[PDB]
Amino acid sequence: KGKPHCSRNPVLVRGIGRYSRSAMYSRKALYKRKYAALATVTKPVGGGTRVVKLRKMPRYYPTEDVPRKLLSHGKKPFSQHVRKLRASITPGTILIILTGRHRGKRVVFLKQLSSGLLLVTGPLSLNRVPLRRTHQKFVIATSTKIDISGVKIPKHLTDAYFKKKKKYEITEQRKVDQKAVDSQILPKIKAVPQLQGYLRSVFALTNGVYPHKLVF
Amino acid sequence: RVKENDQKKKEAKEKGTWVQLKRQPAPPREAHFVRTNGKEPELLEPIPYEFMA
Amino acid sequence: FYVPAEPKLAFVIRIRGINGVSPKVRKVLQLLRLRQIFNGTFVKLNKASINMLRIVEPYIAWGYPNLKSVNELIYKRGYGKINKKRIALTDNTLIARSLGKYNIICMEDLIHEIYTVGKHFKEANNFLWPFKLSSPRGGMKKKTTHFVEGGDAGNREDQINRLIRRMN
Amino acid sequence: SGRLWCKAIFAGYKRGLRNQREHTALLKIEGVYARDETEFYLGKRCAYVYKAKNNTVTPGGKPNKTRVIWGKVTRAHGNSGMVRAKFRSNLPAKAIGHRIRVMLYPSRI
Amino acid sequence: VLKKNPLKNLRIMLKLNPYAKTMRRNTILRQARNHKLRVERAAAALAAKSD
Amino acid sequence: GVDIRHNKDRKVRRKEPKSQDIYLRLLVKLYRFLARRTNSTFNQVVLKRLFMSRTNRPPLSLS
Amino acid sequence: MKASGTLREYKVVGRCLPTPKCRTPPLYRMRIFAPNHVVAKSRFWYFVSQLKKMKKSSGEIVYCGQVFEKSPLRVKNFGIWLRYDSRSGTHNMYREYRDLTTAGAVTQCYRDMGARHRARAHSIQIMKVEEIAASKCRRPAVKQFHDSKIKFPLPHRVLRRQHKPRFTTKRPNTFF
RNA sequence: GUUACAGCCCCGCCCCGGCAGCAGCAGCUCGCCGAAUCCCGGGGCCGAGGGAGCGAGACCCGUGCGCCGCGCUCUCCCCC
RNA sequence: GGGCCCGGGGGGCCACGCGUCCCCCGCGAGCGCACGGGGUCGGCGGCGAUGUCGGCUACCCACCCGACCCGUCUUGAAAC
RNA sequence: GGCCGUCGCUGGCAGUCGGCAGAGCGAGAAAGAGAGUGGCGCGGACGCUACGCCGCGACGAGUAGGAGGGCCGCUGCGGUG
Ligand SMILES: [Mg+2]
Ligand SMILES: [Mg+2]
Ligand SMILES: [Mg+2]
Ligand SMILES: [Mg+2]
Ligand SMILES: [Mg+2]
Ligand SMILES: [Mg+2]
Ligand SMILES: [Mg+2]
Ligand SMILES: [Mg+2]
Ligand SMILES: [Mg+2]
Ligand SMILES: [Mg+2]
Ligand SMILES: [Mg+2]
Ligand SMILES: [Mg+2]
Ligand SMILES: [Mg+2]
User: Fold this and answer.
1) Largest Cα–Cα distance in chain D?
2) Of A114, C82, F33, F61, which has the highest C-beta tally within 10 A?
3) Phi, psi (5° rounding) for residue C34?
4) Strand H: which nucleotides have any atom within 7 A of a protein Cβ?
5) Is residue C28 a contact partner of residue C52, using CB atoms and an 8 Å limit?
6) Are D69 and D52 in contact (CB under 8 A)?
7) F7 is in an annotated binding site
8) Contacts 24+ apart (CB under 8 A), G82-88
9) Separation between Cα atoms, residue C12 and residue A11, nearest integer Å
């Protein structure tokens, strides 16, 4: 019985600790921490008491089984993967969603969600784009930012809030959340000159415009 | 070399020092110092051509 | 002036192919265990070895390798001739199981034995299968002439490290 | 309300002089004519759009006659802003000198 | 066994050479310390450009 | 390419008896097991000789 | 030799290895212009085998280091004494260049001997490179740059970068 | 003609005169390198194999993240 | 420089027990992390009953690259 | 790096040894998870046509010619289905 300390030596490089194991032996203080030395349930029957069996043996065996497979190690499921971002996508940046039905719309970034997706809302007043998820890869990042650091994005909306159910009818919670985030963002994009007209516009490549050449 | 190795193997057996008896190819020559004691090295020049024939 | 010791160890890479080779050149190339193009071996130098490398100079490129070249060759292209089979050096138990009778029990013992050419260089080297190196990235200058006359054959002394890194 | 792709020409296949290796395609993206500028397009998804006789299904829409072969810009070719691309089905030689679309969307910005 | 590269994989290297752990722990500490000394000498040189 | 002569890579030594008689093949099934599972070199020689032809196991007279 | 890249200049010294006949053999030094130190040691043994009864296996190289330019920011006048095989006969030349470094002037000499006389690097033996005062120069192409008030336009500036606009609209200017 | 209203070159004495700095982010004035070498990132192609067991013992029949390999916390006690 | 950097008067260490004597000056346990004996997700999105989905191979056509007619005798055959 | 075959290791497996039980023989270091005598719950995949199954390495041009394997093909006979 004890409270857990954190890991003493810092992550110097990935997989390499900053302190060697003698300095770590001294830091843990191991010099003074030496040490030396269901399947059955009885049930009454109205007979006697039977001893019933939990997980009784199977009644059907298929004509052939596959063998078990070996043990790999670094193969985590999706809900335990590490979630990256770019350095160019920061909360407040303006993005260009490229692929969906909102192609080319200049649209405001809110937060990195739990599944890695971008909570992304270029306002429903301007873009006609809701509180919507997008993907990091399928988004170009414009270097045009708002100081959104002082808004209260709600805690209840997360990756399970935007995941599909099964005619899609707009619930009232979508409207209330859209308003409660829209009214917090929209004065900060009105506080910048001509940013709302930039958000109403759509992105288009035109003649002599090459994406390797024009910077944003 | 048979006779000399018999002499070198009977000797240094009671003494116990291990003595090399196989021949060995000519090694790379070991590091050494070269003394330019006083004088500098003489500068060599390609000679110009002159047609003796 | 300090004249350093003449180098005891050479990495020999075969640069020319398998077609149209003289019988004495073919015999010496198969005594150095160079049976493909871009195969490599470590050779210790002495009067016998240097004349064997003189007799096959157009077909080999060789020089005097670095310590880092020994490190990358043993760690990345390092395989062992275990039970007359090419088995990858992925554990020190493999090196110990064959060469432990020479007190060579880890990868570092074998690297020390190859680089600082030891008493048991023959067995640590013959434990190593010939190195299977790729084509030189960037390329060759010219395969057919000597390094001195602007090519790649022959002794390129310290400069074999630029081509080990180019090939390994 | 505009163009969301870049204009590339399917120049030819990856070839030696007397051998062509048609699993790899060669693409000439418009406006890039050096290897310094081709670093943008590597890994971007390329597409050969073409229209045929019979209706085929469209994801998110009604059946049209337009079809595609999707690709991937793999690595730079040559020294002058040419590039290699590798598609799921190898491109027809019907498409030599015709337009393929190099999309922006596998973005690295 | 899949030959993993010891020059890439840190732990295949540590399975083969455990002293590479301290050869690599040193020269992270060494190089960061020398980079601190480089920045500090540059800051003293800029102060001497002021002074 | 590699310069090995593939001339003598196949060793023509006898792997199994050419006879189809079932008792000799049962004795071979017994000594295959004894040859790979004992450390003895008797069983290798006896396994080898149960493969060989009639002219390679000649009759041994009584004397 | 393949006179490749830029030549470097080397101080290669060496000697015959000692016998009990001569206990301490004398050291011989040369100035080798070479791409690298390996071909510089080879070119050393070339000229030493010509001048002495000395081969590589009966001798040794004691020092081989690059000698740098002691003034690489001064434009200087180099006179190079040549020896080259023609198609017919071999010839002696004096020849003048004007570079910052001696290795640069000898690189320029190899390019110019290959240019004018179609002679390749194995024909050419550099025997003497000497930096030369501006009053002692013999060749007029070098002497015309010895003007304190030198002044000239860049008259007909043919433009490069021709394919960056492959298809331009204005014809290019060439007067600048 | 010889410092004058520009400069260049050499020698001697000044601590190799001294202060940077240092094969230079004056991001190219000229090299060889890395046990004297490490970190991070981007693109491409691939994913073959498939009963590796762990702990609990004849005082028990559990369970499949198991070897080698690296090191994390707790079985001491405080402080921020 | 080398001697475990011989010996005496702020950083790092594959260094950690108690006692007896000569000489020199063999069982601690558990729990998570993982560059660790070859890929998985305990992540998803669309379209589908009269006009669409799949079907490499086999039917026809087109394009790019390739490509002379087989047997034979011969040193050599697409051979006038 | 994947797959096909060949060759080699004359490599591995008869150990499917189960309340008549104890699940191992990859491991740098000639040889034993030896036997002795004094001080509740009834369970545990696949396999092995051993002419079979399995695992490692390297290798693969071919005329004339040689040899092997064909669960390639034709016609009749003894058996069998
Ligand atoms: Mg040839
Ligand atoms: Mg390249
Ligand atoms: Mg030739
Ligand atoms: Mg053959
Ligand atoms: Mg044969
Ligand atoms: Mg054609
Ligand atoms: Mg005929
Ligand atoms: Mg005839
Ligand atoms: Mg004829
Ligand atoms: Mg014919
Ligand atoms: Mg004819
Ligand atoms: Mg082959
Ligand atoms: Mg064949």
Assistant:
1) 45
2) C82
3) -115, 90
4) 9-10, 19-21, 23, 29-40, 42-45, 48-52, 62, 64-78
5) yes
6) no
7) yes
8) G82/G109, G82/G113, G82/G124, G82/G125, G82/G126, G82/G127, G83/B46, G83/B48, G83/B49, G83/G124, G83/G125, G83/G127, G84/G113, G84/G117, G84/G119, G84/G123, G84/G124, G84/G125, G85/G119, G85/G123, G86/G117, G86/G119, G86/G123
9) 42
Classify strands C9-14 and C79-82 as parallel, antiparallel or unpaired: unpaired
Q: Is D31 left (phi over 0), alpha (psi -120 to 50) or beta?
A: left
Q: How many CA atoms lie within 13 A of A63 on its CB side?
A: 0
**How many whole angstroms separate alpha carbon C114 and alpha carbon G72?**
44
The answer to whether the CB atoms of E15 and C88 lie below 8 A apart is no
CA A70 / C1′ I34 distance in Å = 18
* Cα–Cα distances in angstroms (integers) from residue G142 to residues C123, G78, G118, G139, in the given order: 65, 10, 22, 6
Please tell me the distance from the alpha carbon of residue G134 to that of residue G146, in angstroms, as a whole number. 7
List the beta bridge partners of residue D12.
D26
Q: How far is the CA of C26 from the centre of ligand 5 (A)?
A: 22
Q: Do chains C and D touch (3 or more CB pairs under 8 A)?
A: no
Contact G119, G20 (CB under 8 A): no
User: At which residue do the structure tokens 């085929």 appear?
Assistant: D56
According to the entry, how was the structure determined?
cryo-EM
Could you give the angle at which helices C92-99 and C107-115 cross, rounded to 10 degrees? 60
Distances (CA, A) of C85 to C12, C38, C128: 22, 20, 11
- Of chain E, the end-to-end C-alpha distance in Å amounts to 64
What is the nearest CA distance from B40 to chain C, expressed in angstroms? 11
Separation of alpha carbons D100 and D70, rounded Å: 10
Phi/psi of residue C143, nearest 5 degrees: -75, -25
Is D41 an 8 Å CB contact of chain A? yes
Question: Using the CA of F33, which nucleotide's C1' is the nearest one?
Answer: J14
- B32 contacts in chain C (CB < 8 Å): 3
End-to-end Cα separation, chain D, in angstroms: 22
| Contact yes or no for A16 and E11 at CB 8 A | no
Q: Is G18 helix (H, G, I), strand (E, B) or coil?
A: coil
What is the C-alpha to C-alpha distance for residues A100 and A103, in angstroms, rounded to an integer?
Answer: 5
C60: helix, strand or coil: strand
Integer-rounded Cα Rg, in Å, for chain C is: 16
Q: What is the resolution of this structure in A?
A: 3.9
Q: With contacts defined as CB-CB under 8 Å, which chain C residues touch E4?
A: 90
- Helices F42-51 and F22-37 cross at an angle (nearest 10°) of 150
Task: Say how far apart CA G170 and CA G102 lie, in whole Å.
Answer: 45
Residue A111 burial class via C-beta count within 10 angstroms: exposed 0-12, middle 13-18, buried 19 and up: middle
CB of C29 closer than 8 Å to CB of C21: yes
In 3D space, the residue among D11, D5, D4 whose CA is nearest the CA of residue D81 turns out to be D11
> What's the token pair of residue C131?
């190195």
Candidates C22, C25, C35, partner chain F, best to mutate (most F CBs within 10 A): C35
Cα C134 to Cα C13: distance, rounded to the nearest angstrom: 11
d(CA G174, CA D47): 44
- Interface check for A116 against chain D (CB to CB < 8 A): the answer is no
CA of A42 to C1' of H60 (A): 21
Show which of residues 3-62 on chain C sit within 8 Å of chain F, judged by CB atoms. Answer: 17-19, 21, 26, 30, 35-36
The stretches of C10-167 forming alpha helices (DSSP H) are: 23-31, 47-54, 67-76, 92-99, 107-115, 121-127, 161-167
- Whether there are 3 or more C-beta pairs closer than 8 Å between F and D is no
